[PDB]
Design an enzyme around this catalytic site. Structure first.
Site, PDB file in Angstrom:
ATOM      1  N   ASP C 754       0.827  -1.196   0.000  1.00  0.00           N
ATOM      2  CA  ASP C 754       0.000   0.000   0.000  1.00  0.00           C
ATOM      3  C   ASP C 754       0.863   1.248   0.000  1.00  0.00           C
ATOM      4  O   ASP C 754       1.945   1.280   0.594  1.00  0.00           O
ATOM      5  CB  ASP C 754      -0.944   0.023   1.210  1.00  0.00           C
ATOM      6  CG  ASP C 754      -0.313  -0.571   2.455  1.00  0.00           C
ATOM      7  OD1 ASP C 754       0.932  -0.655   2.514  1.00  0.00           O
ATOM      8  OD2 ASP C 754      -1.063  -0.952   3.376  1.00  0.00           O
ATOM      9  N   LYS C 823      -5.031  14.070  11.469  1.00  0.00           N
ATOM     10  CA  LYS C 823      -5.017  12.947  10.541  1.00  0.00           C
ATOM     11  C   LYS C 823      -6.060  13.084   9.440  1.00  0.00           C
ATOM     12  O   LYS C 823      -5.784  12.746   8.283  1.00  0.00           O
ATOM     13  CB  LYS C 823      -5.240  11.638  11.300  1.00  0.00           C
ATOM     14  CG  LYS C 823      -5.095  10.388  10.452  1.00  0.00           C
ATOM     15  CD  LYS C 823      -5.690   9.185  11.160  1.00  0.00           C
ATOM     16  CE  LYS C 823      -5.050   7.892  10.692  1.00  0.00           C
ATOM     17  NZ  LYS C 823      -5.666   6.708  11.345  1.00  0.00           N
ATOM     18  N   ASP C 983      -5.003   1.672  -4.774  1.00  0.00           N
ATOM     19  CA  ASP C 983      -3.736   1.833  -4.037  1.00  0.00           C
ATOM     20  C   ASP C 983      -3.524   0.763  -2.957  1.00  0.00           C
ATOM     21  O   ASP C 983      -2.926   1.004  -1.907  1.00  0.00           O
ATOM     22  CB  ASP C 983      -3.574   3.271  -3.499  1.00  0.00           C
ATOM     23  CG  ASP C 983      -4.599   3.683  -2.432  1.00  0.00           C
ATOM     24  OD1 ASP C 983      -4.832   2.972  -1.432  1.00  0.00           O
ATOM     25  OD2 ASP C 983      -5.192   4.768  -2.610  1.00  0.00           O
TER      26      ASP C 983
END
Lengths: 324, 192, 1062
Positions: C754, C823, C983
């Site tokens: 990833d 985040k 991804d």
DNA sequence: TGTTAGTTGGGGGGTGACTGTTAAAAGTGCATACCGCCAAAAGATAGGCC
DNA sequence: GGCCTATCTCCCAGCGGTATGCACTTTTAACAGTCACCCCCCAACTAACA
């Protein structure tokens, strides 16, 4: 927004709201005093003033100009709108809760069957009048929020456009609405005095309006304001129409006015899994009538005649899933 | 009284006013001629008439149209809502009745065979004239009493006649059904 | 009686005389039409010469010669409905009804203007299929009278008509010199015309009689692409090891038969995953109440259906549009079964009118397509093509030369399976509304369910109740509470799926064309697009077929993968789900739980319904191999067509799926699985690989107790961020350790690779930003570097430099900053975000803490969002320039009526479905009038807010799709199975190094091309260089040619970076 | 097992079809705007469309 | 300046009733002489429908 600068209407309105001044309980609750000439007018006539001024400015002026007399201002920073916040209320300097305004004065509670405890005067907002009437109606039918105690008198000013739809009768086909049923059913309404727009002074958040063009533009409409007195009927809440099951009646009024050019038969077929003809000749009316041809009292009659047929369990076809 | 009968009379057309004027003259001149030929000749004469004289005659039609508009306005002002509802109900009933006779004449003109008559109906048809009583109802009651008094041996011929009539009805119904299927009259076909 | 018979007979004779007079009376008279029904065939034409031939050349074979003599000489809703009417009357044999409506619409003036040329050509071909000359002559009379010049297909119908009914006439294809004179060549008749193959055969029979020396042009093998990025895969002189599946020919053939029967049945039933209910007297009462379950309503639906068809037929005869062929397409049995199966699984809360109509119309169309393919004989052709195709990619079979499945499918004879385009949206809306009304009015039940002797009244099954929210209302079909009580009273088998929703059992159809692929018979579009919008398909078919080739092949590579279910994993999930569920770890508890309570019950029931569906599909598909098709979206990203069991799902889903074909581990085998399990724990993110492997060796006892005895153990696997995947990986590594030789273990477990913040990775690649190329791991370094902690540590510098003065910053911000509050905004900067939404996010983050003064939330959110945006501007420089440039280009193209358009480097073109809200359209009806928005209207103007917000995230996702496609096509050659979540790249545990190598290689090869420069050149050739207006040429030409200048970054160094996609 | 119905032959009487020529009231289909505010805090932050 | 809003895609979901105006075809009746047709009464059966 709207404030008064004329002593003539101040004295006339003081005599109108005077009536019988012998009120050992809490006497006046002005929605928004502003400049406060109405406050000194009411103190002059022998009536106390409790200024519930919403704006954070002009708060100390009323108490500094009123503490020295025996009649006390007792100014509290709140509003007659924006109370009992739900899903919130941890911090609130503009808005303030329900019990705080009454523990500061000592009314506590009385039953609904008693006499008239208090008296609240003031304005409706310029826009969002319907939202205010809906909040007041939900507080009234829920027996919570402000009207948790016995009763109230909520004399205010209302516009003519909403006055026409505030109460209507069988007939008046363009203006018969749901709130017209609700407000006659809940409280009895009497009109007291008539006012123009030009007498009132237009006011802004920073200060009074300084533009002659704007006030002339707003005065050229000349909406005739209306002093209205709600008083709750003593036996509104009954065994059939309880304060826990009112929202079903609100659903009935919203759906039954959903298709205006229709019949009672079709709406009652869509709402209840019962033969609607039985109910219609049980209350005394015929089949082919139209919904714009019924009394406001007839709606409560129909709604209360539905429930006492306890033989059938499924009777309403409305749940909380319809709230969405 | 009928609400529709109390309405003011409709404005008379210029062509029909001329036809009504010339109808007694043509009836007196030609008494043995049929009315259809007389109406066709009057209409041909109206076709020979120029439209300018039609306009001059229709000026009075305009004036009487204004008079009729005033009269119908006064009548509508004098009508109660109950009378208006009764008039609307009478108009709807008249329209439904007119559609009923139109459908009945359409079904009759297509050649639909009649229902098969029973032996009692055959006896009534045969012996109605030879029945006591001047009134037709008395004749019908006498024939019904005679049919009740008849025996099965005498009724056998009438049963056979009814059977032949039913067979003829079945043949005509089959031919009629085939002709409607030829033109696709699926609604006129019997379900059973 | 005798004289009555005589007079009735005479009257009958006059009645037949009047009937014969009516027959002599023309059908144009209203009385003859009203009294007697008939369909009119002889046309009426409003011209003197055409009426002259009407008398002459109908009083008269001149009508045979007239067929050749006549050859010498923005759509509204009603037009779409009429065209669909005629095309549907072609397929069913009702040509007289189409002729009747055509001649009636030609009779009246207003309905003449609605008719277009294709409306004539459809019924021309329809009468040509039966070979009647005079009616072709009549339709051509109509065409020439209306002023419409005939077309090539119109002449094709004529030549096909002379071709059949062989009379051996000399004048077959008579006056083809007139076809030459008008300019039409005969070679264009065979190709690029939508007529079927039998029409080509009959017109070939017609064409050889005049000219015997006439042959088809010779065919050629399909060209290969010469593009730079796609050259190596489609090239000669290469040694390729192509993958092959493990199971033999017989299993594949049996599963193809099973899938064909599954799709022809069009419905599957799934056993109940919950516990059985105990038998009782009430259980028997509700089980034996099947007398009213279908039998009292199937007959009612048949009655209503026949009555509706008769009514619609008599409305057809009276010159109006109808749904009669649209309801006579499918037989009565399945169109009633549709309503019966839709009526199942009705919740207590009901659904809207529009949703039910939209479901019913598509459900009808799918069955129409599959049944038509059944009748026409293409199923046997598909079988006999697929058997020979499946010789490739079979373990027991061989090939002369190895090649891809698409090239072998084209190398065999062409299947020639052509399917018709779906109906336009108004016809679907009307048909769904009609079916919903028929369901709601036909089905009625006695309300005396508890006691039959109490009352006898018939109540509706579904009520029309209004639901009010804000000002608006909506119609809702509410079931009666007694039927809800009956449904949830006794038994719940209650499971039924379609054929599209369940995954396949046979290899998917290769994507040969945008029309054909995915499922074998059921239809599936290549691009997922909202209903009514069709510009994507037009762009995909207008392009040359070669340019899409590799893209389609990539999709085929994503469809051939084989999947199995891990029973060991979901045994515990079933054990938790049947009993009182623990809401921890994702398993839902029942809503029995033993204002806000109703909300909790609603959410819990909504989650538990999907839990029922997913776990029932899991138990049904147990011990059976399943394979998933894929399709591509509006931008280019790929998703599986089944929405229930896609591996692009939660965590309990990804705990079940496991590869079928296996690879041996070997030298570098178990190290990758150990690093993977440390990655799935989440405790030890910021370490290099050697420390992750050392940590994995440290916790072996924890792993073994998490695996060997999972249920009721030391419960280690719950503390991970992703618990169930951690348990599956720990099971696999515990099984792999206990082996005689761990190198020879067969691996069936995918390994995630990833890329953290892939959007900023693509932005740093595009801008050549040296500073940002270290924050995201695009540079060789020994330790991984996160951008979240970088931002949360860089804001501290501003915090101290401000709070040295000692404002209210030191109260909160010098105490409380961390990477858990920053985040979300750094996750969503690649997408759209603004200061308002980011302020809301950190406001929630700040008020989440229990130990925090709540009086200072409001100003702290403002200060923190300002400093976060300042830090992100400082760290990333070229990213903001590219975003501003893209937004400016989208704004400048959306001011004019131009939807933004671009072409990917792999050849796929992209459009955007953003336009202003059209004039909504309402269907008048009996029970209710419903409204919808038509998305196919090009007339409505672009929405310039939904395009400027939306171009920059869509371009990056397009580049992501291109990079994934390139690495998929290059992993296929070396023998690696590639499965991609976006991804998130998966292969077997053995071959991760080769994936990483070609992943970095294809990244460098993709980003070596001037992507921004070719985008600028494409957006200058298109959307510019026009004399339409001067301001466009002044602004767009200046703005689009200005591109952000690159920095100083060596891109080849990405080939030696150990943390990109790691 | 529960509900309609047509002639069967007279007999009184309004009424549609047969003859009609020409303007003219009204139903059909479509589109569009207004209402339908059944409610629910702001503490203020930008920035581009109208 | 006055005003409105706020995060891309997939999954699921995605508003109705009523008054008024516009374009147009279809009855339609304006009225009347003449001829069978049908509404209804005198009671019933089987054909048909439900």
């Amino acid at each position: 927004k709207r404030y008064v600068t004329d002593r003539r209407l101040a004295e006339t309105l003081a005599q109108i709201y005077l009536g019988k001044p012998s009120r050992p309980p809490h006497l006046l609750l002005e929605c928004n005093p502003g400049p406060g000439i109405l406050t000194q007018a009411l103190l002059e006539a022998g009536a106390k003033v409790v200024a519930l001024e919403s704006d954070k400015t002009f708060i100390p002026h009323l108490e500094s100009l009123g503490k020295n007399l025996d009649g006390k201002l007792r100014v509290i920073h709140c509003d007659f709108f924006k109370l009992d916040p739900r899903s919130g209320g941890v911090i609130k300097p503009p808005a303030m809760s329900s019990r705080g305004l009454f523990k500061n004065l000592g009314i506590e509670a009385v039953p609904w069957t008693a006499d008239i405890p208090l008296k609240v005067v003031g304005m409706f907002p310029s826009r969002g009048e319907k939202r205010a009437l809906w909040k007041l109606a939900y507080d009234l039918y829920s027996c919570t929020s402000i009207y948790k105690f016995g009763r109230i008198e909520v004399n205010m000013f209302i516009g003519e456009k909403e006055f026409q739809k505030l109460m209507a009768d069988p007939g008046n086909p363009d203006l018969y609405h749901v709130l017209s049923v609700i407000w006659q059913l809940a409280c009895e309404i009497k009109v007291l005095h008539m006012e123009p727009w030009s007498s009132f002074d237009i006011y802004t958040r920073k200060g009074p309006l300084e533009n002659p063009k704007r006030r002339e533009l707003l005065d050229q409409l000349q909406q005739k304001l209306y002093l209205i007195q709600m008083i709750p009927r003593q036996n509104l809440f009954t065994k059939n129409l309880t304060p826990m099951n009112y929202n079903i009646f609100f659903h009935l009024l919203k759906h039954c006015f959903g298709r205006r050019s229709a019949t009672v038969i079709d709406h009652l077929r869509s709402l209840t899994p019962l033969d609607a003809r039985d109910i219609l000749m049980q209350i005394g009316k015929q089949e082919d009538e139209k919904v714009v041809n019924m009394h406001p009292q007839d709606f409560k009659t129909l709604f209360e005649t539905i429930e006492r047929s306890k033989d059938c369990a499924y009777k309403w076809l409305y749940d909380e899933t319809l709230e969405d | 009284s009928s609400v529709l009968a109390s309405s003011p009379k409709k404005p008379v057309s210029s062509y029909l006013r001329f036809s009504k004027e010339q109808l007694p003259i043509f009836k007196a001149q030609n008494p043995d001629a049929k009315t259809t030929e007389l109406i066709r000749r009057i209409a041909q004469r109206w076709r020979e008439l120029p439209d300018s004289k039609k306009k001059i005659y229709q000026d009075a039609y305009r004036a009487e149209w204004q008079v009729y508009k005033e009269e119908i306005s006064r009548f509508k002002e004098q009508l109660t809502p109950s009378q208006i509802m009764s008039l609307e109900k009478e108009i709807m009933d008249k329209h439904l009745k007119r559609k009923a006779m139109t459908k009945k004449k359409e079904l009759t003109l297509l050649g639909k065979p009649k229902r098969p008559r029973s032996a009692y109906n055959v006896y009534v048809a045969e012996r109605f004239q030879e029945a006591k009583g001047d009134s037709p109802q008395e004749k019908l009651k006498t024939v019904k009493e005679n049919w009740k008094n008849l025996s099965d041996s005498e009724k056998e011929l009438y049963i056979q006649h009814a059977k032949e009539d039913e067979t003829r009805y079945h043949n005509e119904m089959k031919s009629w059904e085939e002709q409607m299927i030829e033109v696709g009259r699926k609604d006129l076909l019997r379900r059973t | 009686w005798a004289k009555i018979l005589e007079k009735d007979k005479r009257t009958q004779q006059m009645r037949m005389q009047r009937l014969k007079a009516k027959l002599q009376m023309p059908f144009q008279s209203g009385e003859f039409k009203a009294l007697t029904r008939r369909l009119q065939v002889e046309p009426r034409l409003l011209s003197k010469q055409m009426a002259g031939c009407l008398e002459d050349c109908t009083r008269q074979s001149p009508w045979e010669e007239q067929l050749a003599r006549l050859l010498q000489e923005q759509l509204s809703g009603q037009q779409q409905r009429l065209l669909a009417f005629f095309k549907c009357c072609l397929l069913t044999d009702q040509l007289p009804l189409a002729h009747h409506l055509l001649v009636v619409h030609h009779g009246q003036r207003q309905k003449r203007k609605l008719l277009t040329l294709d409306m004539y050509n459809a019924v021309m071909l329809g009468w040509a299929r039966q070979g009647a000359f005079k009616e072709l002559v009549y339709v051509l009379f109509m065409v020439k009278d209306a002023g419409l010049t005939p077309d090539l297909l119109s002449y094709a119908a004529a030549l096909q008509c002379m071709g059949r009914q062989d009379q051996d006439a000399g004048t077959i294809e008579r006056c083809l010199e007139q076809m030459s004179q008008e300019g039409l060549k005969l070679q264009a008749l065979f190709t690029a015309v939508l007529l079927s193959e039998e029409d080509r055969a009959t017109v070939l029979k017609a064409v050889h009689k005049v000219k015997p020396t006439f042959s088809l042009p010779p065919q050629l093998p399909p060209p290969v692409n010469t593009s730079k990025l796609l050259r190596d895969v489609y090239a000669k002189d290469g040694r390729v090891s192509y993958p092959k599946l493990h199971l033999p020919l017989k299993t594949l053939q049996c599963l193809f038969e099973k899938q064909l029967h599954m799709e022809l049945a069009s419905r599957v039933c799934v056993v109940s995953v919950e516990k059985p209910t105990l038998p009782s007297k009430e259980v028997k009462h509700a089980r034996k109440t099947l007398k009213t379950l279908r039998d009292q309503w199937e007959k009612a639906l048949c009655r209503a259906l026949r009555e509706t068809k008769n009514r619609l037929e008599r409305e057809v005869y009276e010159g109006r549009f109808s749904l009669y062929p649209f309801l006579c397409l499918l037989d009565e049995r399945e169109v009633v079964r549709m309503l019966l199966q839709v009526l199942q699984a009705l919740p207590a809360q009901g659904e809207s009118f529009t949703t039910l109509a939209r479901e019913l119309s598509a459900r009808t169309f799918s069955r129409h397509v599959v049944q038509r393919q059944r009748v026409s004989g293409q199923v046997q052709a598909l079988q006999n093509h697929y058997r020979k195709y499946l010789c490739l990619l079979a373990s027991d079979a061989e090939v002369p030369e190895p090649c891809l499945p698409r090239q072998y499918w084209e190398e065999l004879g062409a299947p020639e399976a052509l399917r018709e385009q779906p109906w336009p949206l108004p016809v679907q809306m009307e048909l769904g509304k009609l079916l919903a009304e028929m369901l709601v009015q036909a089905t009625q039940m006695p309300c005396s369910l508890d006691k039959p002797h109490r009352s006898s009244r018939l109540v509706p099954v579904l009520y029309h109740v209004y639901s009010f929210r804000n000002v608006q209302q909506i119609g809702i079909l509410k079931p009666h509470p007694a039927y809800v009580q009956l449904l949830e009273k006794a038994a719940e088998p209650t499971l039924t799926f379609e054929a599209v929703d369940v995954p396949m059992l046979c290899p998917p159809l290769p994507w040969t064309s945008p029309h054909s692929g995915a499922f074998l018979l059921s239809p599936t579009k290549l691009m997922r697009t909202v209903e009514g919008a069709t510009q994507h398909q037009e762009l995909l078919e207008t392009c040359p077929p070669t340019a899409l080739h590799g893209a389609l092949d990539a999709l085929t590579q994503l469809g051939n993968c084989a999947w199995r279910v891990n029973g060991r994993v979901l045994d515990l999930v079933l054990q938790l789900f049947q009993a009182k569920g623990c809401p921890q770890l994702g398993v839902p508890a029942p809503p029995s739980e033993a204002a806000h309570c109703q909300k909790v019950a609603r959410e819990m029931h909504s989650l538990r319904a999907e839990a029922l569906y997913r776990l029932s599909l899991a138990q049904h598909l147990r011990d059976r191999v399943f394979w998933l098709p894929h399709n591509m979206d509006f931008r280019g990203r790929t998703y599986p067509c089944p929405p229930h069991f896609n591996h692009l799902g939660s965590d309990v889903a990804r705990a079940l799926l496991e590869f079928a074909q296996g690879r041996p581990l070997g030298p570098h085998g178990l190290d990758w699985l150990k690093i993977h399990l440390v990655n799935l724990t989440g405790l030890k993110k910021r370490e290099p690989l050697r420390k992750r492997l050392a940590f994995a060796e440290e916790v072996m006892d924890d792993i073994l107790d998490s695996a060997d005895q999972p249920l009721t153990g030391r419960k280690w696997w719950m503390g991970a961020e992703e618990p169930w995947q951690t348990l599956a990986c720990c099971m696999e590594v515990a099984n792999a350790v206990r082996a005689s030789d761990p190198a020879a273990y067969v691996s069936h477990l995918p390994v995630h690779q990833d890329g953290s913040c892939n959007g900023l990775q693509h932005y740093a690649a595009l801008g050549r930003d040296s500073v940002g190329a270290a924050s995201v791991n695009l540079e060789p370094s020994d330790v991984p570097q996160d951008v979240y902690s970088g931002v949360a540590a860089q804001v501290e510098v501003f915090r101290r430099q401000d709070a040295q003065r000692g404002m209210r910053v030191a109260q909160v911000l010098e105490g409380f900053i961390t990477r858990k509050v920053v985040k979300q905004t750094v996750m969503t900067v690649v997408y759209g975000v603004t200061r308002y939404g980011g302020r809301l996010q950190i406001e929630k983050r700040l008020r989440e803490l229990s130990d925090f003064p709540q009086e200072f939330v409001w100003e702290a959110s403002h200060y923190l969002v300002r400093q976060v945006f300042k830090s992100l501007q400082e760290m990333f420089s070229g990213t903001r320039a590219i975003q501003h440039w893209l937004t400016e280009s989208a704004r400048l193209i959306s001011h004019m009526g131009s939807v933004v358009e671009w072409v990917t480097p792999l050849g796929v073109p992209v459009i955007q479905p953003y336009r202003l809200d059209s004039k909504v359209k309402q269907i008048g009806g009996g029970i209710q009038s419903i409204t919808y928005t038509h998305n196919g209207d090009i007339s409505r103007k672009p929405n310039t807010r939904k395009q400027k917000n939306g171009f920059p995230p869509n371009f990056i996702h397009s580049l992501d799709s291109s990079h994934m496609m390139l690495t998929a096509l290059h992993c296929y050659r070396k023998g690696l199975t590639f499965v991609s979540v976006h991804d998130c790249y998966w292969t077997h545990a053995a071959d991760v190094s080769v994936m990483n190598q070609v992943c970095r290689e294809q990244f460098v090869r993709l980003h070596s091309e001037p992507i921004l420069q070719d985008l600028s050149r494409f957006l200058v050739k298109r959307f510019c260089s026009e004399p339409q207006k001067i301001l466009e040429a002044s602004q767009l030409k200046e703005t689009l040619q200005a591109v952000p200048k690159p920095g100083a970054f060596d891109l080849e160094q990405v080939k030696r970076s150990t943390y990109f996609f790691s």
